[PDB]
Amino acid sequence: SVITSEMKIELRMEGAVNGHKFVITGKGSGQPFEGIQNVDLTVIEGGPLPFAFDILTTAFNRVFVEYPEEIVDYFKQSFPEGYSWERSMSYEDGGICLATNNITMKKDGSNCFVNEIRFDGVNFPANGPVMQRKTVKWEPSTEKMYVRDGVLKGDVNMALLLQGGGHYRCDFRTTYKAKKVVQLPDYHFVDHSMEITSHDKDYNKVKLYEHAKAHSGLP
Amino acid sequence: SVITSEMKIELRMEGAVNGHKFVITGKGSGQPFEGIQNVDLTVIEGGPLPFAFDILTTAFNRVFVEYPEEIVDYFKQSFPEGYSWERSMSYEDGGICLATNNITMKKDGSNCFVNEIRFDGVNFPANGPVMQRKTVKWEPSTEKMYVRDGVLKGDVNMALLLQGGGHYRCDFRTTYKAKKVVQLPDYHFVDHSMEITSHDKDYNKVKLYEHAKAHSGLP
Amino acid sequence: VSVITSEMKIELRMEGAVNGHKFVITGKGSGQPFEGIQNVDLTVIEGGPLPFAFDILTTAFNRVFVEYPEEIVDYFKQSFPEGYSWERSMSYEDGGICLATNNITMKKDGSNCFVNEIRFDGVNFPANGPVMQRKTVKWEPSTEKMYVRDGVLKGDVNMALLLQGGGHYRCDFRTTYKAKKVVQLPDYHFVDHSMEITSHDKDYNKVKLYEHAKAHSGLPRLA
Amino acid sequence: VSVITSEMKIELRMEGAVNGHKFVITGKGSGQPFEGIQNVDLTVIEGGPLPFAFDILTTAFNRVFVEYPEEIVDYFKQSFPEGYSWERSMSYEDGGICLATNNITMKKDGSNCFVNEIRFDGVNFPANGPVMQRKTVKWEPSTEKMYVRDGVLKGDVNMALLLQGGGHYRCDFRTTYKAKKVVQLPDYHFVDHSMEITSHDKDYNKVKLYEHAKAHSGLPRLA
Numbered sequence: 001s002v003i004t005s006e007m008k009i010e011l012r013m014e015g016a017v018n019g020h021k022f023v024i025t026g027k028g029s030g031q032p033f034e035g036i037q038n039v040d041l042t043v044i045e046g047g048p049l050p051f052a053f054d055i056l057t058t059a060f061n062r063v064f065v066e067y068p069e070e071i072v073d074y075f076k077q078s079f080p081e082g083y084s085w086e087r088s089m090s091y092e093d094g095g096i097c098l099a100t101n102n103i104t105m106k107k108d109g110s111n112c113f114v115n116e117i118r119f120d121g122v123n124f125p126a127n128g129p130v131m132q133r134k135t136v137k138w139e140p141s142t143e144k145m146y147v148r149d150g151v152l153k154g155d156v157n158m159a160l161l162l163q164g165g166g167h168y169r170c171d172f173r174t175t176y177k178a179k180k181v182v183q184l185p186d187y188h189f190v191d192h193s194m195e196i197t198s199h200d201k202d203y204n205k206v207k208l209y210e211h212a213k214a215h216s217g218l219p
Numbered sequence: 220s221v222i223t224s225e226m227k228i229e230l231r232m233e234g235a236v237n238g239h240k241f242v243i244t245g246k247g248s249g250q251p252f253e254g255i256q257n258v259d260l261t262v263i264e265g266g267p268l269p270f271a272f273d274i275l276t277t278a279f280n281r282v283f284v285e286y287p288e289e290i291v292d293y294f295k296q297s298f299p300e301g302y303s304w305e306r307s308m309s310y311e312d313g314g315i316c317l318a319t320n321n322i323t324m325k326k327d328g329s330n331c332f333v334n335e336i337r338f339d340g341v342n343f344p345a346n347g348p349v350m351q352r353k354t355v356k357w358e359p360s361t362e363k364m365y366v367r368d369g370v371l372k373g374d375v376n377m378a379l380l381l382q383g384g385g386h387y388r389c390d391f392r393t394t395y396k397a398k399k400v401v402q403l404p405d406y407h408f409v410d411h412s413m414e415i416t417s418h419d420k421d422y423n424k425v426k427l428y429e430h431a432k433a434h435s436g437l438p
Numbered sequence: 439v440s441v442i443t444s445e446m447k448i449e450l451r452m453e454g455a456v457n458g459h460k461f462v463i464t465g466k467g468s469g470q471p472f473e474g475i476q477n478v479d480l481t482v483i484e485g486g487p488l489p490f491a492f493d494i495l496t497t498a499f500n501r502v503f504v505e506y507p508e509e510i511v512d513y514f515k516q517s518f519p520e521g522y523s524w525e526r527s528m529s530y531e532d533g534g535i536c537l538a539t540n541n542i543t544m545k546k547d548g549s550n551c552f553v554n555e556i557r558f559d560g561v562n563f564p565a566n567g568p569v570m571q572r573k574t575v576k577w578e579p580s581t582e583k584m585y586v587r588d589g590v591l592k593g594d595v596n597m598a599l600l601l602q603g604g605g606h607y608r609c610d611f612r613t614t615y616k617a618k619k620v621v622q623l624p625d626y627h628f629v630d631h632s633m634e635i636t637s638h639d640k641d642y643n644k645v646k647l648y649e650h651a652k653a654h655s656g657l658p659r660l661a
Numbered sequence: 662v663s664v665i666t667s668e669m670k671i672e673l674r675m676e677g678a679v680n681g682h683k684f685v686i687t688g689k690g691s692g693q694p695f696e697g698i699q700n701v702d703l704t705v706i707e708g709g710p711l712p713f714a715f716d717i718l719t720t721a722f723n724r725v726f727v728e729y730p731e732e733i734v735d736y737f738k739q740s741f742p743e744g745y746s747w748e749r750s751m752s753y754e755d756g757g758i759c760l761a762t763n764n765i766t767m768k769k770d771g772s773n774c775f776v777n778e779i780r781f782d783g784v785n786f787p788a789n790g791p792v793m794q795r796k797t798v799k800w801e802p803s804t805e806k807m808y809v810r811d812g813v814l815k816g817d818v819n820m821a822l823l824l825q826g827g828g829h830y831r832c833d834f835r836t837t838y839k840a841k842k843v844v845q846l847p848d849y850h851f852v853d854h855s856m857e858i859t860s861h862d863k864d865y866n867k868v869k870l871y872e873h874a875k876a877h878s879g880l881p882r883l884a
């Protein structure tokens with residue numbers, strides 16, 4: 001393992017949603033062993049975003065999960081080479097997003113992760129919560145981690161809290177591919193809890209916070 | 220609330236899977252405040268079952284969940300009238316099951332739940348783990364509970380451990396309908412951990428155990 | 439050797455529940471297997487008036503009644519007299535879902551009657567959706583896609599209910615067909631369906647149903 | 662007023678990634694909008710040889726090229742000169758999934774050319790599935806189901822790739838069509854498609870593609 005308790009984050013995201021192109025960059029940092037990260041985002045091309053910013057935030061690194069010793073940590077072993085993930089996000093009204101992230105060490109040697117993120121979304125109804133920007137936050141969640149074909153899969157049932165109560169459900173299916181041979185975990189869970197801690201009125205500037213911890217289910 | 224710490228369970232299940240009809244009955248008991256239940260099942264019609272018994276076990280009562288005080292307990296408030304649920308189970312190879320349970324107090328006044336269960340499954344490939352009986356157990360899981368249309372919904376990502384490693388994924392979507400007006404909870408989670416503790420060779424006699432506890436996600 | 443006449447009878451019994459609501463329905467009808475046409479008269483004998491839209495049932499009420507061109511292998515007409523069965527799932531877009539099965543054999547008295555043992559199960563329809571609120575008009579005509587897997591026949595169709603005051607409510611079908619004996623297996627092909635309720639009393643306790651169905655192999659590549 | 666000639670050109674640029682693998686593809690072709698026929702020549706200009714089956718791309722490479730009978734409203738031919746765009750999702754049965762978009766307008770120099778700006782994105786294809794292992798033969802012909810929602814056009818089709826050594830690999834399409842201006846909206850109808858790769862070099866850097874497409878309104882109820 002090549003991970004410090006204090007680490008930086010740099011990221012660039014390039015995407016379109018319902019055809020609307022956009023670019024976002026972010027500088028942040030976090031504590032890989034506490035499972036905590038912060039990031040400051042800026043919409044550098046394509047703002048104000050027509051859609052709810054919340055659909056983006058999950059694309060903005062499972063290195064930042066506090067793993068107990070008794071569970072193998074696919075992610076912390078993948079470095080310095082890194083890993084990537086690819087994800088699908090099926091919303092219950094037919095809307096869907098794919099996203100990919102390639103995560104590696106900054107080439108200058110320093111304590112920083114570089115993230116290359118692609119994000120694409122189609123079929124959101126013009127009148128649904130995403131297009132109408134009526135989302136409040138993602139609820140905390142529990143991702144389920146298991147192995148297939150010698151790589152790691154994680155599936156989570158996600159839910160957006162809507163304005164005036166009510167939830168809007170989304171199913172995630174992620175694949176994690178380490179850039180080198182690493183020890184493979186047994187079935188386990190990761191609790192996540194992510195929230196937007198600050199944003200300007202049109203979400204051109206957004207600060208994001210996640211806390212994440214792994215476990216192996218009820219005794 | 221009309222619930223004792225010690226309570227009996229009686230149940231009858233009637234179903235077909237890939238057209239193969241069957242009847243199962245069960246006597247058991249559990250501790251509604253500890254979130255623990257036991258049941259003894261018998262296949263009284265249609266045995267030996269062509270398919271994996273594991274697909275059945277989740278149909279064999281969210282009253283048996285240990286709820287903390289800070290979370291509203293939809294289920295324990297529904298009694299003595301009871302509640303019902305309806306569920307769908309989407310397996311990743313195309314196989315799918317629906318099930319329903321009507322839960323009420325035994326009519327003789329005693330400390331016993333009566334369960335009327337219907338179970339139907341179609342489209343399991345002749346060569347998949349279910350038809351080939353290659354399942355080992357359901358992994359522990361975390362159901363996600365939220366309200367819609369004044370009733371309670373719970374969705375869980377389930378996974379069967381297969382012989383020689385490997386998992387076989389299933390998505391649950393349950394609806395819970397209390398038979399009277401009850402206080403409605405906020406979004407929360409229920410950890411489940413269920414296992415077959417004993418069975419004869421052809422699964423005509425099976426003993427089942429679940430432990431279940433509610434919580435509200437990572438601090 | 440096929441055992442099918444151009445005139446054939448249909449007898450059926452359907453037993454189900456939808457959102458927990460139990461019901462039984464029987465039906466007498468007849469059809470013309472080579473023209474791909476069938477008629478049936480249904481009676482709700484237990485559980486009526488039905489809380490849900492009758493439309494969600496009608497598709498469970500036999501692919502023998504499809505007009506097959508000679509150049510397409512007919513899985514169904516070869517399966518007789520032994521018959522076949524099917525299993526189906528029906529995924530509605532609002533989360534509602536139904537499974538159904540049918541076991542189809544020749545009436546035991548030797549006459550030219552198909553006997554249909556049908557089971558039907560529906561869960562998770564929103565209290566306020568078109569199905570529970572009974573706001574459906576009809577199924578649009580459709581094209582089922584037939585293909586082989588694991589030595590049996592699969593057919594998947596995009597279905598759509600027309601709602602009151604326009605608008606459609608989508609459903610995805612996934613059916614499996616299992617012949618009771620070894621039969622010659624078809625290439626990828628299509629079945630057009632067009633089914634409608636031709637008559638019903640106010641509460642749908644009595645319903646007459648009509649389907650016309652024809653197989654084909656998709657648009658010619660040349661103009 | 663429609664602005665469509667019977668002879669029309671096609672220019673396109675597609676930019677994507679699949680399983681993270683970036684690529685660019687451009688194409689020159691032409692078609693006959695009233696016969697429902699189109700041709701295109703594709704070049705992989707960046708990212709070749711492609712690790713994945715080229716077949717998963719070809720459907721992104723214009724519903725103007727459908728022969729519409731007079732009795733069916735043609736959403737697409739009315740949308741011009743301004744054009745329309747579509748967004749699509751493609752759900753493969755092994756978990757693989759692709760989204761794509763196309764923005765279709767008239768070439769700015771006034772000539773009779775459609776310009777297509779296409780984006781394509783694919784994730785979660787198993788390393789060992791037909792797509793990554795390049796084991797596809799062709800898409801079977803299909804019937805798309807067209808219906809209206811929220812004042813735009815939706816079309817959903819059950820697609821199927823024929824694999825090497827028989828067997829099919831299913832995919833569900835869900836497309837949305839958005840005209841760039843107010844146009845008359847159609848009733849529920851169908852489009853038959855039949856598309857094939859007519860020519861390619863060994864690594865699919867160069868591919869010629871042909872589609873024939875015709876609309877209809879489903880099997881007559883009468884024999």
Ligand code: NA
Pocket residue numbers: 036211
């Ligand atoms: Na903290």
Ligand code: NA
Pocket residue numbers: 255430
């Ligand atoms: Na215990």
